[PDB]
Amino acid sequence: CVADYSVLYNFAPFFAFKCYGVSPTKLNDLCFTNVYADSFVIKGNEVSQI
Amino acid sequence: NAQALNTLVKQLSSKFGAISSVLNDILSRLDPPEAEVQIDRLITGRLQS
Numbered sequence: 001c002v003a004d005y006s007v008l009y010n011f012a013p014f015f016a017f018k019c020y021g022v023s024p025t026k027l028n029d030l031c032f033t034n035v036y037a038d039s040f041v042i043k044g045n046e047v048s049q050i
Numbered sequence: 051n052a053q054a055l056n057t058l059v060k061q062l063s064s065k066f067g068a069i070s071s072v073l074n075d076i077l078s079r080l081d082p083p084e085a086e087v088q089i090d091r092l093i094t095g096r097l098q099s
Contacts, residue, residue, distance in 0.1 A: 021069075023081040030079065 003035065004028070016047065058099060066095035 005027045017024060042050075065071050068088040076088045 022079055023084075025081075026079065 003032075061099045062096070064095060066091045068092055 019027075022030065063071050068076070068091045070076060070088075071092070073089070073092070076085055080088070
C-alpha cells in the first residue's frame with residue numbers, strides 16, 4: 001500500500017519522535033520491504049526505557 | 051595488470067564499517083550531521099586502496 005506518514009503528524013501532538021536509522025523528515029521519500037507496528041500503553045516514567 | 055585493476059575496481063563494494071557501500075543510500079536516509087560519520091570511513095578505505 002501507499003504509506004503516507006503525513007497523517008501521523010496532525011493526528012496527535014506527540015512529545016517523543018525518536019528515529020534511529022532514518023531521519024524523520026525523509027520518511028516520505030523512501031521505500032521499505034516490510035513494516036511492523038506494535039502498540040501498547042505504559043506509564044510516563046517508563047517511556048525512557050523504550 | 052588485469053589482476054591489480056580488477057582488485058582496485060572490486061574494492062568499491064566494501065562497507066569498511068559503515069552501514070552501506072552506496073553513497074546515495076546514506077545521502078537519502080540521514081540528516082547532514084549524521085552523514086559525515088558514515089562518509090569518513092568510506093573515504094579512508096578508498097584512499098588506502
